[PDB]
């Protein structure tokens, strides 16, 4: 689970491959399922942004 800004971060194609950062992590183990939760942009009072695996 990622905030909907790190989705922008992980959309770039890798330097010299044919995959994006969001697909290589999706292709590991058997299958990983990445989706964006909106409440993860504010976990404490001010702001931290978090990720869950």
């Amino acid at each position: 689970l990622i905030p909907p800004s790190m989705r922008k971060v992980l959309a770039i194609r890798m330097p010299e491959t044919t995959m994006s950062y969001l697909d290589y992590f999706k292709s590991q183990n058997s299958g990983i399922e990445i989706d964006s939760i909106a409440e993860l942009e504010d976990i404490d009072g001010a702001g931290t942004k978090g990720v869950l695996v």
């Binding site: 909106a38 409440e39 942009e41 504010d42």
Partner: protein, 152 residues
Amino acid sequence: AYENLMLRPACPGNLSDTSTYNIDGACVAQGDIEFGSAVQVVGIVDGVKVVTALSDGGTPYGIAFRSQYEHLSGKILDGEVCNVVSHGRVWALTSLDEAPSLFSKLQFGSGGVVTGGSGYAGWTFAGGFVKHEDGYIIEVRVKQNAFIVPPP
């Protein structure tokens, strides 16, 4: 409010809590009245009350209420019956940017919009402050028999 929320918090001219509210149904409008904003009582004709938007030198009476059957134009037009929240807890319109102190008596000006707190007598500010369009919305704890019209 705004993004990161499934639902918008509140809309002006609507009750917030279901706790001892009173709605008058025998009222007539003299001019264009928008949801929210306090109203006066110009006079009484055969039982009904002729309410107008707040002006200078007039004691507020209640806050206009939003009904989706009576008013099909987004506002209360001239010569139309309307509902007024004489008592209860309703979302009003304000021209402020920061929430006042809790349980502080609000002040009204212009067309019934709240201009500031630190009053002497009247209604009080409940716990609530939300952003709407370009501006904010304040929650007002309306109590009957709060404003007494001054003697001449």
